[PDB]
Coordinates of C-alpha atoms and ligand atoms in Angstrom, one line a residue:
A6 CA 34.5 -4.4 11.2
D7 CA 35.4 -3.2 14.7
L8 CA 32.3 -3.4 16.8
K9 CA 33.9 -2.2 20.0
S10 CA 34.7 1.1 18.4
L11 CA 31.2 1.4 17.1
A12 CA 29.7 0.8 20.5
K13 CA 31.9 3.6 21.8
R14 CA 30.8 6.0 19.1
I15 CA 27.2 5.4 19.9
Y16 CA 27.9 5.9 23.7
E17 CA 29.7 9.1 23.1
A18 CA 27.0 10.4 20.9
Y19 CA 24.5 9.5 23.6
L20 CA 26.4 11.4 26.3
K21 CA 26.7 14.4 24.0
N22 CA 23.2 14.8 22.7
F23 CA 21.0 14.0 25.8
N24 CA 20.9 16.5 28.6
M25 CA 20.1 13.8 31.1
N26 CA 22.0 10.5 31.6
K27 CA 21.8 7.8 34.2
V28 CA 25.0 8.9 36.0
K29 CA 23.8 12.5 36.3
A30 CA 20.3 11.4 37.4
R31 CA 21.7 9.2 40.2
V32 CA 23.9 12.0 41.5
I33 CA 20.8 14.1 41.8
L34 CA 18.5 11.4 43.1
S35 CA 21.1 10.5 45.8
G36 CA 21.3 13.9 47.4
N41 CA 20.6 23.8 43.4
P42 CA 19.1 20.6 44.8
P43 CA 15.8 19.4 43.3
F44 CA 12.6 20.9 44.6
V45 CA 10.3 18.2 45.8
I46 CA 6.7 18.3 44.4
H47 CA 4.5 16.1 46.6
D48 CA 1.2 18.1 46.8
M49 CA -0.6 21.0 45.2
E50 CA 1.2 23.5 47.4
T51 CA 4.7 22.4 46.3
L52 CA 3.6 22.0 42.7
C53 CA 2.5 25.7 42.6
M54 CA 5.7 26.7 44.4
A55 CA 7.9 24.8 41.9
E56 CA 6.0 26.3 38.9
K57 CA 6.5 29.8 40.1
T58 CA 10.2 29.3 40.2
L59 CA 10.9 26.9 37.3
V60 CA 8.1 27.7 34.8
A61 CA 6.9 31.1 35.9
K62 CA 5.5 31.9 32.5
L63 CA 3.1 29.0 32.8
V64 CA 1.4 30.3 35.9
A65 CA 1.7 34.1 35.2
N66 CA -1.9 34.3 33.8
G67 CA -3.7 34.8 37.1
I68 CA -7.2 33.3 37.1
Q69 CA -6.7 32.4 33.4
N70 CA -4.1 29.8 34.3
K71 CA -4.9 26.3 33.3
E72 CA -6.0 23.5 35.7
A73 CA -3.1 21.9 37.7
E74 CA -3.5 18.6 35.8
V75 CA -3.3 20.4 32.4
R76 CA -0.2 22.4 33.4
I77 CA 1.5 19.1 34.4
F78 CA 0.6 17.4 31.1
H79 CA 1.9 20.4 29.3
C80 CA 5.2 20.1 31.1
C81 CA 5.4 16.4 30.1
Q82 CA 4.9 17.4 26.5
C83 CA 7.7 20.0 26.6
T84 CA 10.0 17.3 27.9
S85 CA 8.9 14.9 25.0
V86 CA 9.4 17.7 22.4
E87 CA 12.9 18.3 23.7
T88 CA 13.8 14.6 23.7
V89 CA 12.6 14.4 20.1
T90 CA 15.2 17.1 19.1
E91 CA 17.9 15.2 21.1
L92 CA 16.9 11.9 19.5
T93 CA 17.0 13.3 16.0
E94 CA 20.6 14.4 16.4
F95 CA 21.6 11.2 18.2
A96 CA 20.3 9.2 15.2
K97 CA 23.0 10.6 13.0
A98 CA 25.6 8.5 14.9
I99 CA 23.9 5.2 13.9
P100 CA 25.8 3.7 10.9
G101 CA 23.6 3.9 7.8
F102 CA 20.8 6.1 9.3
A103 CA 22.1 9.4 7.7
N104 CA 22.4 7.4 4.4
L105 CA 18.7 6.5 4.4
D106 CA 16.1 8.4 2.4
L107 CA 14.8 11.5 4.2
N108 CA 11.3 10.0 4.3
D109 CA 12.5 6.8 5.9
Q110 CA 14.5 8.8 8.5
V111 CA 11.3 10.6 9.4
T112 CA 9.3 7.3 9.6
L113 CA 11.9 5.6 11.8
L114 CA 11.9 8.6 14.3
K115 CA 8.1 8.9 14.2
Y116 CA 7.6 5.4 15.5
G117 CA 10.7 5.2 17.6
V118 CA 10.9 8.4 19.6
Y119 CA 8.3 7.6 22.2
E120 CA 9.7 4.1 22.7
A121 CA 13.1 5.7 23.2
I122 CA 11.5 8.4 25.5
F123 CA 9.9 5.8 27.8
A124 CA 13.1 3.7 27.9
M125 CA 15.2 6.7 28.9
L126 CA 12.6 8.0 31.3
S127 CA 13.5 5.0 33.5
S128 CA 16.9 6.6 34.2
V129 CA 15.2 9.5 36.1
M130 CA 12.7 7.4 37.9
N131 CA 12.8 5.5 41.2
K132 CA 9.9 3.9 43.1
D133 CA 9.0 7.2 44.8
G134 CA 9.1 9.6 41.9
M135 CA 10.9 11.1 38.9
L136 CA 13.3 13.9 38.1
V137 CA 11.8 16.8 36.0
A138 CA 12.7 20.2 34.7
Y139 CA 16.3 19.3 33.7
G140 CA 17.0 17.8 37.1
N141 CA 15.7 20.7 39.2
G142 CA 12.4 19.1 40.3
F143 CA 11.4 15.7 41.7
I144 CA 7.7 15.0 41.5
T145 CA 6.4 12.1 43.6
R146 CA 4.8 9.0 42.1
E147 CA 1.9 9.3 44.6
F148 CA 1.2 12.9 43.8
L149 CA 0.9 12.0 40.1
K150 CA -1.5 9.1 41.0
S151 CA -3.6 11.6 43.0
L152 CA -4.5 13.7 40.0
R153 CA -8.0 13.5 38.7
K154 CA -8.7 11.1 35.8
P155 CA -7.6 10.6 33.2
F156 CA -4.3 12.5 34.0
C157 CA -3.5 10.2 36.9
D158 CA -3.2 7.3 34.3
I159 CA -0.4 8.9 32.3
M160 CA 2.8 8.2 34.2
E161 CA 1.9 5.2 36.4
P162 CA 2.4 2.6 33.5
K163 CA 5.7 4.3 32.8
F164 CA 6.8 3.8 36.4
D165 CA 5.7 0.2 36.2
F166 CA 7.9 -0.3 33.1
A167 CA 10.8 1.6 34.6
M168 CA 11.0 -0.4 37.9
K169 CA 11.5 -3.6 36.0
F170 CA 13.8 -2.0 33.4
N171 CA 15.9 -0.5 36.2
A172 CA 16.2 -3.9 37.8
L173 CA 18.3 -4.9 34.8
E174 CA 21.0 -2.5 36.1
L175 CA 21.9 -1.2 32.6
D176 CA 24.4 1.6 32.3
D177 CA 24.6 4.4 29.8
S178 CA 26.8 2.3 27.5
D179 CA 24.1 -0.3 27.4
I180 CA 21.2 2.2 27.1
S181 CA 22.8 4.1 24.3
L182 CA 22.9 1.0 22.1
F183 CA 19.4 0.0 23.2
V184 CA 18.0 3.3 22.1
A185 CA 19.9 2.9 18.8
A186 CA 18.3 -0.5 18.3
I187 CA 14.8 1.0 19.0
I188 CA 15.3 3.5 16.2
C189 CA 16.5 0.8 13.7
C190 CA 13.3 -1.2 13.3
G191 CA 12.6 -2.5 9.8
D192 CA 8.9 -3.3 10.5
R193 CA 7.8 0.2 10.9
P194 CA 4.7 1.0 8.8
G195 CA 5.3 2.8 5.5
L196 CA 9.0 2.3 5.1
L197 CA 10.5 2.8 1.7
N198 CA 13.7 0.8 1.7
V199 CA 13.0 -2.0 4.2
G200 CA 16.0 -4.0 3.0
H201 CA 18.6 -1.4 3.9
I202 CA 16.9 -0.7 7.2
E203 CA 16.9 -4.4 8.1
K204 CA 20.6 -4.5 7.4
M205 CA 21.1 -1.4 9.5
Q206 CA 19.1 -3.0 12.3
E207 CA 21.1 -6.3 12.1
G208 CA 24.3 -4.3 12.4
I209 CA 23.4 -2.3 15.5
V210 CA 21.7 -5.3 17.2
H211 CA 24.9 -7.2 16.5
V212 CA 26.8 -4.4 18.3
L213 CA 24.3 -4.4 21.2
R214 CA 24.5 -8.2 21.6
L215 CA 28.3 -8.2 21.8
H216 CA 28.4 -5.3 24.1
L217 CA 25.9 -6.9 26.6
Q218 CA 28.0 -10.0 26.5
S219 CA 31.2 -8.1 27.6
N220 CA 29.5 -5.6 29.9
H221 CA 27.2 -8.1 31.7
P222 CA 28.9 -11.5 31.8
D223 CA 26.7 -12.4 34.9
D224 CA 23.4 -12.3 32.9
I225 CA 23.5 -14.6 29.9
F226 CA 19.8 -13.8 29.0
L227 CA 20.2 -10.0 29.1
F228 CA 20.0 -9.7 25.3
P229 CA 16.7 -11.6 24.9
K230 CA 15.4 -9.7 28.0
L231 CA 16.0 -6.4 26.1
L232 CA 14.4 -7.7 22.9
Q233 CA 11.3 -8.4 25.0
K234 CA 11.5 -4.9 26.6
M235 CA 11.5 -3.5 23.0
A236 CA 8.2 -5.3 22.4
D237 CA 6.9 -4.1 25.8
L238 CA 7.7 -0.5 24.8
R239 CA 5.8 -0.8 21.5
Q240 CA 2.7 -1.9 23.5
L241 CA 3.3 0.8 26.1
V242 CA 3.4 3.5 23.4
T243 CA 0.2 2.1 21.7
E244 CA -1.6 2.3 25.0
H245 CA -0.2 5.8 25.6
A246 CA -1.4 7.1 22.3
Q247 CA -4.9 5.7 23.1
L248 CA -4.9 7.7 26.4
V249 CA -3.7 10.9 24.6
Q250 CA -6.6 10.5 22.2
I251 CA -9.1 10.3 25.1
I252 CA -7.6 13.4 26.6
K253 CA -7.7 15.2 23.3
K254 CA -11.4 14.5 22.9
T255 CA -12.5 15.0 26.5
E256 CA -10.2 17.7 27.8
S257 CA -10.6 21.0 25.8
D258 CA -7.9 22.7 27.8
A259 CA -5.3 20.0 27.2
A260 CA -3.7 21.4 24.1
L261 CA -1.3 19.0 22.3
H262 CA 2.0 20.5 21.0
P263 CA 1.9 20.5 17.2
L264 CA 5.1 18.5 16.8
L265 CA 3.7 15.7 19.0
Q266 CA 0.4 15.8 17.2
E267 CA 2.2 15.0 13.9
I268 CA 4.0 12.1 15.7
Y269 CA 0.7 10.6 16.9
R270 CA -1.0 11.2 13.6
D271 CA -1.6 7.8 11.8
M272 CA 0.8 6.1 14.2
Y273 CA -1.5 3.4 15.6
Ligands
LIG301 C1 8.0 23.2 38.1 C2 8.0 22.0 37.1 C3 6.9 21.1 37.5 C4 7.0 19.8 36.7 C5 5.6 19.2 36.7 C6 5.6 17.8 36.1 C7 5.6 16.7 35.7 C8 5.5 15.2 35.2 C9 6.7 14.9 34.2 C10 7.6 14.7 33.5 C11 8.8 14.4 32.6 C12 8.4 13.7 31.3 C13 8.2 13.3 30.2 C14 8.0 12.7 28.8 C15 6.5 12.2 28.7 C16 5.4 11.8 28.5 C17 4.0 11.4 28.3 C18 3.0 12.6 28.4 C19 3.4 13.7 27.4 C20 3.4 13.1 26.0 O1 2.5 12.3 25.6 O2 4.4 13.5 25.2

């Protein structure tokens, strides 16, 4: 009935459940300041401070590229936990069957992750380790294949996404819409999910109209970004499969393995 109140509920749930938001990220990115990781020396320095356990194995430590990939996985795993609690604020989600809830999150989490990753990215690098590290885009590109191909497509998406100049009130509803997709494979009650999707997308459309009167096409632009994210995730899963088969040391967190299993 009152779509403005619903938009605010989602926004407040977004601020409460995600450790990073765009406002907090910009404060850090503008200038315990973040340690800058721009080469192997500064990577090893940062690890010894921020993730000492990971490099406390002496000569048995993993290769630098594998340690980085492992840190990315940890971030993903944490964002999954945050996304699962955020989903409860979406009208109708908690009323869905448990199996449908799992399915929606299975296919949505990485689309949501790459969307929200844009908030901690600029053209030179990205915030990591809960805002305490900044790793340069060029360093990540300098890694040996195939690890240098992980983040660059995400930077490419983020640069265009950030040019839309969304704020957290927009992003929170966008992430909600990502989760409420009625065309996910294997859904039980597609009808109820489609109605849930229609409701949240209705809220998103009205919010964008009020919050961005200067950009009349912003809503269709974001619909297209949702399609772009789906393709970005499919391509990411393909890369993860190559790493799994060709990099014996690059262990995949079990929760993420289940997410990728039978996805695409
Ligand atoms: C001392 C800390 C050093 C940080 C090193 C670093 C780094 C780079 C980074 C980072 C943040 C992130 C993320 C989510 C993701 C993803 C896709 C890949 C994983 C997955 O497939 O889940």
